[PDB]
């Protein structure tokens, strides 16, 4: 199938309390596989999925040095940005970075990503062409001119087209079924009387991967969009996800309602009822 790799960095300044805290996490699709935290006792890249553990010491050592350096660079960027925005040197600010590659089934690059937010707002982003930037404001235009002169886009493009594609391919080979084969949800319908006249039907999807899913309730095969309570998809904590959808129905009419589940892991869309 199509796959993606993403790294997410967060740097948060704390003036007066030392250098900014830097955290990175890496994902393949919806699976986190690495982390780094600058405040750890002995900061190093650490495995967060079983299939990455097989990578040799060189891998971990190289990655660890990269994160240490990026933390120092982010510390410089945070100093620069507060200057560009004329902000107090006393306050805490956040710089977030998100980058990676999307590949099709043949493993070729479909789309590259390299973008940044400052205090939760889009700041600068590498365009789809992988060679030009979009800046959100005149501060970000300073960054843009700096990066244009440094040929940063070239460096980004080289990673996104090369190491990003090739390492994602590797992880997919080493993650095998964990990454390549969707895990369908375990589904069931529960029933909870509210009164003599009303009951809740809740449709559950548990233990599915990846996170993308659709749950709908139908009455006589018509979507009950305006009357369905639907929770945001949530992690189970064991790399799988959960979701549910509920509808309140007149007692005695439960038989008219069916729950419909669409997930990549299912052979075909499921129809469930209270039974």
């Amino acid at each position: 199938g199509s796959h993606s790799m993403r790294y997410f960095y967060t740097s948060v300044s704390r003036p007066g309390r030392g250098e900014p805290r830097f955290i990175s996490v890496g994902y393949v699709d919806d699976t986190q596989f690495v982390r780094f935290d600058s405040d750890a006792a002995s900061p190093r890249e650490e495995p967060r999925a079983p299939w990455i553990e097989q990578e040799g010491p060189e891998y971990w050592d190289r990655n660890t040095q990269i994160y240490k350096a990026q933390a120092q660079t982010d510390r410089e960027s945070l100093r620069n940005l507060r200057g560009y925005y004329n902000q107090s040197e006393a306050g805490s600010h956040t710089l977030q970075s998100m980058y990676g590659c999307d590949v099709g089934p043949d493993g070729r690059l479909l789309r590259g990503h390299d973008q940044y937010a400052y205090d939760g707002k889009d700041y600068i982003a590498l365009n789809e062409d992988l060679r030009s930037w979009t800046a959100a404001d005149t501060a970000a235009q300073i960054t843009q001119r700096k990066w244009e002169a440094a040929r940063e886009a070239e460096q980004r493009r080289a990673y996104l087209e090369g190491e990003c594609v090739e390492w994602l391919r590797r992880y997919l080979e080493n993650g095998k079924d964990k990454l390549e084969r969707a895990d369908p949800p375990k589904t069931h319908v529960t029933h909870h009387p509210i009164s003599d006249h009303e009951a809740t039907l809740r449709c559950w999807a548990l233990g599915f991967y990846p996170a993308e899913i659709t749950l709908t309730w139908q009455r006589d095969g018509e979507d009950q969009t305006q009357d369905t309570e639907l929770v945001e998809t949530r992690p189970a904590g064991d790399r799988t996800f959960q979701k549910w959808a509920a509808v309140v129905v007149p007692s005695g009419e439960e038989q008219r309602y069916t729950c419909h589940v669409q997930h990549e892991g299912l052979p075909k869309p499921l129809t469930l009822r209270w039974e």
Binding site: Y59, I66, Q70, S77, Y123, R156
Partner: peptide, 9 residues
Amino acid sequence: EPRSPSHSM
């Protein structure tokens, strides 16, 4: 694997 460090902003 992560990308080599960027220039500062």
